[PDB]
């Protein structure tokens, strides 16, 4: 999250020299990014899907040899 670090750096550099106060802009941008962005459950689901796809491919290839 480079935005929070950049906001903290700007607030620390502009503590005494408050020429351009972008604290509100940074907070609004952070809130908007958090609203727009939206555990290992996804990884487990992906592993299960990969295993199921491998099983389906194996089952499809099991019916390759067929004479009559």
């Amino acid at each position: 999250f480079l935005p929070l670090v950049h906001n903290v750096i700007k607030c620390m550099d502009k503590d005494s020299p408050d020429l351009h106060q972008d604290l509100n802009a940074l907070k609004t941008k952070f809130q908007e990014l958090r609203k727009l962005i939206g555990p290992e459950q996804q990884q487990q689901q992906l592993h299960s899907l990969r295993e199921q796809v491998r099983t389906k491919n194996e089952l499809l290839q099991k019916y390759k040899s067929l004479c009559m």
Binding site: Y63, L66, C67, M68
Partner: protein, 52 residues
């Protein structure tokens, strides 16, 4: 009447034998046709299977 009875008795067995032979031939032909149709169907099934 005697001649008619004799002719009927003479024509019954030959006609029965001819009908039995024709029925056997028809059964053989139907069985062969069914076997050929089943073979062609199995060939088409194998073709459709190997298609995918």
């Amino acid at each position: 009447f005697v001649h008619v009875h004799h002719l009927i008795n003479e024509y019954r067995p030959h006609q029965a034998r001819e009908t039995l032979r024709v029925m056997m031939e028809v059964q053989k032909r139907q069985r062969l046709e069914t076997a050929e149709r089943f073979q062609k169907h199995l060939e088409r099934v194998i073709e459709m299977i190997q298609n995918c």
